[PDB]
């Protein structure tokens, strides 16, 4: 018969970092294998479609990376703007909203994220279709949408709602009544503002916070440097440079050494492309998760446990980052619980009374009905409870008086 119920709460904001896209590369198979060598190219032609298959695989990856970026960020039908008066019920969003004084129009957190994350023989790098400014504009639209219209943003037209009422809805969605927010609105706004400041300092202070994106950049840089480095290898040849082979050896011997270098260089390209396809699949899975998180955490209030951070989910805010997205997840965390004595039902005049919305608790002398996620004792009445069965079938039923308002009126 012992139940613990929170008497206070903490507003917590956590950070989730996801890769969305990776560097788009393109390879000139002939320049890489047989650069500025006519003889090598003529021997290379005997391998058929090998180049075409490699070029096609990398082209498919390049297209996929823009698709991943679009799927994660291009989730708004319209570009939403915030009001000129930044008073969202007392909540301070200045660190997540775009800072108009910066030419890049990034929020302070996005600027930090961008500041922390840091032509070769026949290799090129393609730019993304959506520039950093365009991604920032999508993020801004997402923030304006959620901040000014809540959850209505993602399922029809955006409908303006006062921010404290949006939060009241979000609290009701986790089993906490609206009056908890309104009575504690100043406390909640102060905890939110504190949590955001803590995140800004946490990301600034911890150099490893963005490792998930830095690893993508570093792995692709390593793959390209490795592929270029392989050009200096001999693979059994007398020299890695084709002009030395043609200068030193008679044509048929040069052809044998050239085929040897061709085999080694094309094997190096197949290894590179295969690794890029595997990484592309990993990035796609990450991008699909990021898009799911965007739809369920930002454009709505997810009820999935630990999907949108630890605690009961209230709301989330996207921030862009190089090659990825960072989500700030705002959750409700129970705090300062007390242990009360409970019972499954109250026995009054032989009827078994059950809570309609809550749990019966005792402070040791009196029985009250409270909401489960926030201690707030109420008088047990016929409006708060319902009757089913007698005082016999329920195990652990306790005798207590249930008040009926109409019966008190009958006395009046």
């Amino acid at each position: 018969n012992s139940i613990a119920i929170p008497t206070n709460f903490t507003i917590s904001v956590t950070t989730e970092i996801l890769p969305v896209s990776m560097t788009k590369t393109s390879v000139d198979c002939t320049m890489y294998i047989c650069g500025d060598s006519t003889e090598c190219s003529n021997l290379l032609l005997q391998y058929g479609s090998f180049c075409t298959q490699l070029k096609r695989a990398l082209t498919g990856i390049a297209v996929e990376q823009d698709k991943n970026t679009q799927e994660v960020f291009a989730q708004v039908k319209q570009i939403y703007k915030t009001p000129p008066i930044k008073y969202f019920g007392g909540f301070n969003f200045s660190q997540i909203l775009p800072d108009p004084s910066k030419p890049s129009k990034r929020s302070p957190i996005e600027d930090l994220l961008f500041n922390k994350v840091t032509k070769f023989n026949g290799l090129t790098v393609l730019p993304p279709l959506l520039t950093d400014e365009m991604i920032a504009q999508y993020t801004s639209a997402l923030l304006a949408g959620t901040i000014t219209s809540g959850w209505t943003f993602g399922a029809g037209p955006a409908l303006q709602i006062p921010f404290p009422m949006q939060m009241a809805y979000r609290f009701n969605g986790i089993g906490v009544t609206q009056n908890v927010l309104y009575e504690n609105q100043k406390l909640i706004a102060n905890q939110f503002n504190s949590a955001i400041g803590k995140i800004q300092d946490s990301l600034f202070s911890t150099p490893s916070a963005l490792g998930k994106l830095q690893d993508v950049v570093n792995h692709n840089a390593q793959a390209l440097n490795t592929l270029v480095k392989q050009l200096s290898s001999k693979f059994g040849a007398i020299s890695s440079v084709l002009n030395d082979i043609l200068s030193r050896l008679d044509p048929p011997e040069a052809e044998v050494q050239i085929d040897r270098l061709i085999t080694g260089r094309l094997q190096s390209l197949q290894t590179y492309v295969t690794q890029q396809l595997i990484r592309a699949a990993e990035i796609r899975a990450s991008a699909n998760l990021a898009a799911t998180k965007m739809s369920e955490c930002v454009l709505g209030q997810s009820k999935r446990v630990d999907f949108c951070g630890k605690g009961y989910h209230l709301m989330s805010f996207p921030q862009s980052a190089p090659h990825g997205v960072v989500f700030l997840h705002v959750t409700y965390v129970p705090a300062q619980e007390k242990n009360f004595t409970t019972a499954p039902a109250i026995c009054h005049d032989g009827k078994a009374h059950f809570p309609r919305e809550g749990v019966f608790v005792s402070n040791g002398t009196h029985w009250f009905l409270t909401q489960r996620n926030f201690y707030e004792p109420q008088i047990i009445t016929t409006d708060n409870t319902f009757v089913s069965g007698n005082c016999d079938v329920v195990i652990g039923i306790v005798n207590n008086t249930v008040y009926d308002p109409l019966q008190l009126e009958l006395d009046s």
Binding site: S26, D28, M31, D66, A74, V76, K77, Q78, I79, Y80, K81, T82, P83, Y87, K119, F120, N121, G122, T124, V125, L126, P127, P128, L129, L130, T131, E133, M134, Q137, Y138, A141, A144, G145, I147, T148, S149, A158, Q160, P162, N225, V228, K229, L231, S232
Partner: protein, 140 residues
């Protein structure tokens, strides 16, 4: 050092040489190269195409056209209006307009191409639109 004759990068490519007679150190920059992309409206609509020289400045392309240096033997006539510098590369077969639209045939770095009727149809380039603007009437 007087001893050293040439230099290399972190990936062992050559990037500098000592002249055998003057002992001056010269840097070696690779000659410009890149991919070529062709933007086609589709042969059931028009036979006009635009050509993107990836990863280069339009200045080096113009110079490579003036001198008979550029390797592809075909040429796209330049009208001035149809030469537009993008971050992806130099686009020499489409006119750039300040009218944004939905992305049709992507080029890169925010620039898309599409085949549209002239202000009589031609290939145009534009910065892609992300969506309509909607200021929400938020209030207390």
């Amino acid at each position: 050092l007087p001893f050293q004759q040439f230099g290399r990068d972190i990936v062992d490519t050559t990037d500098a040489v000592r002249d055998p007679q003057t002992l001056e150190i010269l840097d070696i920059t690779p000659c410009s190269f890149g991919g070529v992309s062709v933007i086609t409206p589709g042969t059931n609509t028009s036979n006009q195409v635009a050509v993107l020289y990836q990863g280069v400045n339009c200045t080096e392309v113009s110079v490579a056209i003036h001198a008979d240096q550029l390797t592809p033997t075909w040429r796209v006539y330049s009208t001035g209006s149809n030469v537009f510098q993008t971050r992806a590369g130099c686009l020499i077969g489409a006119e750039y307009v300040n009218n944004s639209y939905e992305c049709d045939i992507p080029i890169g770095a925010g620039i898309c191409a599409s085949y549209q009727t002239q202000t009589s149809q031609s290939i145009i380039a534009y910065t892609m639109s992300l969506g309509a603007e909607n200021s929400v009437a938020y209030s207390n």
